[PDB]
Amino acid sequence: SSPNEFLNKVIGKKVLIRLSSGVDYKGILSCLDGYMNLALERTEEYVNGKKTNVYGDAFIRGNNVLYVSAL
């Protein structure tokens, strides 16, 4: 179970993405690559509970987040 292996295993599931700053993104994973860049479908941005944005498609740099967990 590499980081990649873990990430593959969560494709198609609602995932929670936390930023060092306590901003969260949640959306269904969709794509990956060697460098942990993540592509998600519809994506929601929260500032501790408070939804503050929605993105139709989003690319997220895994290298630069806090963690990635499956909801």
């Binding site: 930023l19 700053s21 990956l32 460098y35 592509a39 500032v47 139709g56 989003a58 690319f59 630069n64």
Partner: protein
């Protein structure tokens, strides 16, 4: 992903950095490391202490985005 981005070539995108900065700009190019070349970029200003988007813009023009601080790229609604 290095494939996915090409789909948005020449189009205007949103970007978010670690630290909070947010900008918009036209995707002119990029590498595998997620360094971007954006044209006609406008940083969306933030309330000094609230953190929120004020609605005010700031123009920067042609810019090189560093992939080290890039968190999120996203196309325009629609």
């Amino acid at each position: 992903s290095i494939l996915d981005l090409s789909r948005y070539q020449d189009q205007r995108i949103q970007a978010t950095f670690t630290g909070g900065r947010q900008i918009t700009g036209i995707l002119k190019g990029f590498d595998q490391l997620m360094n971007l070349v954006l044209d006609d970029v406008e940083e969306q200003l933030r309330n000094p202490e609230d953190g929120k988007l004020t609605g005010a813009i700031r123009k920067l023009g042609l810019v090189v985005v560093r992939g080290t601080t890039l968190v999120l790229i996203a196309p325009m609604d629609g």
